[PDB]
Amino acid sequence: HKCDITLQEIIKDLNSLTEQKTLCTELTVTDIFAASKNTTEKETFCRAATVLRQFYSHHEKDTRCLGATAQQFHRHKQLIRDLKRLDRNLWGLAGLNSCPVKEANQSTLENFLERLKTIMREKYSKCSS
């Protein structure tokens, strides 16, 4: 389970998401990586899945995000779809819903996603030769 191809599905989701730089991706999430470092891998996935679910739930219909042009609206729908896909995969890996996130620091979604990508690539690296 630990080195399951779900890791690749998550990295794929993150690669697409981290191309986005919009008003929406500058909006913030609670910075789960501002912690002093005290949770299991399962708990880390639960934390990340929780904040991203908060984000897409709150911003799927947000006027700052929805877009004026066809291209902007398309990119917004893609962002929400990919956030849901990534979230689905993170929950699968977490196997837990109970992981209260306490951090004060807010980071942009953009920076949060780049950090998660780093962590996920590290896990992948630790799984392969």
Side-chain angles (χ1 to χ4, degrees):
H1 201 136
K2 19 280 190 271
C3 287
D4 189 84
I5 52 113
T6 293
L7 293 191
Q8 173 63 197
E9 289 296 298
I10 285 166
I11 287 160
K12 285 198 234 242
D13 296 318
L14 287 162
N15 286 342
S16 310
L17 283 163
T18 54
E19 301 148 15
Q20 297 237 198
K21 178 165 196 104
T22 61
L23 176 46
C24 216
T25 55
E26 285 299 280
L27 300 175
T28 64
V29 285
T30 293
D31 185 6
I32 72 166
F33 315 105
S36 301
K37 204 124 244 93
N38 39 65
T39 92
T40 161
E41 206 201 32
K42 263 194 215 308
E43 178 138 50
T44 288
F45 296 136
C46 174
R47 289 159 59 73
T50 292
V51 306
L52 299 170
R53 184 158 184 265
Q54 291 173 342
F55 191 98
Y56 73 68
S57 297
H58 293 164
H59 294 121
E60 178 168 5
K61 297 229 148 29
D62 192 316
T63 62
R64 303 168 292 178
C65 295
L66 280 162
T69 64
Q71 183 173 172
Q72 286 175 334
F73 185 37
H74 173 68
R75 287 188 177 170
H76 174 72
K77 283 184 290 174
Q78 271 184 316
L79 175 84
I80 301 300
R81 275 197 303 263
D82 289 345
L83 290 171
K84 291 171 179 176
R85 283 165 179 129
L86 163 62
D87 205 56
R88 179 180 178 165
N89 288 319
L90 287 167
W91 285 120
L93 250 51
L96 270 120
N97 214 60
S98 13
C99 55
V101 315
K102 303 200 75 175
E103 266 67 45
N105 188 236
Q106 298 291 299
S107 85
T108 64
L109 179 72
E110 187 180 73
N111 286 335
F112 178 91
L113 292 173
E114 284 289 12
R115 192 52 196 172
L116 179 53
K117 191 191 296 172
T118 297
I119 281 153
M120 294 303 304
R121 295 187 52 199
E122 174 73 14
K123 278 153 172 147
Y124 189 106
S125 177
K126 281 299 175 179
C127 284
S128 58
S129 55

